[PDB]
Enzyme design. Structure first.
Site: not given
Ligand code: NI
Ligand code: NI
Lengths: 168, 175
Positions: A26, A30, A92, A120, A155
């Site tokens: 993951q 936020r 996440e 990114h 991207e």
């Molecule tokens: Ni986590």
């Molecule tokens: Ni990249």
């Protein structure tokens, strides 16, 4: 090769046997508002909601997103969550309750203005012309990078475009 | 289920046909020193170096790393790059030349102190307690105790990397 340990100080090969079977599961961001976030990752990017984990004692909800067929996921909730955390390449998306209603909430930092850090995520698409036309039709914000509803950079690239860049 | 569109305003499911075959290919971090970062991601985490791309006009090098048998990858360097960009779940570790020596380099921001934003990446391991004993043995810095079924370790730049096993997740969920 240019990836060899001789060409790359610090590179350790082969991977230690204790690590074999580890997965990169993951990437956590936020997010202010789950409604806008869900629409972006599910509608614009085509990810599925693998799992929603409410954590009341922490006043937060985790939205686990990724490119999987959830019609064939386990039906039992506990086993569906375990299935989620066995899948590589998930997002996440962490909602701290109230940010979407707090008039003093200032926004999350995307890493690309000072203080700089995180860059990114990036999505391999089939065709950059087709992908970008469709993003424009959906009303996506462009920074090739698009922006999610909190301003994180996404991207976009296709393998033909990569091949053309590598060849120069 | 609690993942249904009725239970989740904004959820658009199933996916649009145009998104068929999209993959979540990379997570990009800026890194100060490639030797430290290569050792952490390769020795500590067990990732491989899928591709190194020098971009001299941007004075930067991209290190693409992930869990793959790179002995299975194409030998042709162009084809090996294309292979890399078809693998899900990679790290793009971006080295801007000179940060590893600049005496005034202030560090990269990991997202977990103000201004907050980015959280972490996370790695599913076989056995958290086994993994953490081994991380200890390699002098890895920890963000929190291995307890309540998860921990975070820090990469050389300070980015957080969550560690959990599926038994840890099951225990958390069952509470
Ligand atoms: Ni986590
Ligand atoms: Ni990249």
């Amino acid at each position: 090769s240019k990836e060899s340990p001789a060409n790359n100080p610090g590179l350790h090969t082969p991977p230690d046997e204790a690590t074999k079977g580890y997965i990169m599961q993951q990437t956590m961001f936020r997010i202010k508002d789950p409604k806008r976030t869900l629409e972006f990752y599910s509608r614009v990017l085509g990810m599925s909601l693998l799992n929603k984990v409410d954590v009341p004692y922490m006043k937060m909800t985790l939205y686990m997103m990724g490119y999987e067929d959830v019609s064939s996921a386990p039906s039992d909730p506990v086993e569906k969550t375990i299935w989620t955390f066995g899948r590589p390449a998930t997002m996440e998306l962490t909602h701290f309750w109230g940010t979407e209603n707090d008039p003093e909430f200032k926004g999350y930092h995307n890493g690309n203005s000072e203080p700089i850090g995180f860059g990114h995520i990036g999505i391999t698409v089939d065709d950059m012309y087709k992908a970008c036309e469709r993003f424009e039709s959906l009303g996506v914000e462009f920074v090739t990078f698009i922006k999610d509803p909190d301003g994180y950079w996404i991207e976009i690239f296709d393998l033909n475009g990569i091949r053309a860049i590598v060849n120069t």
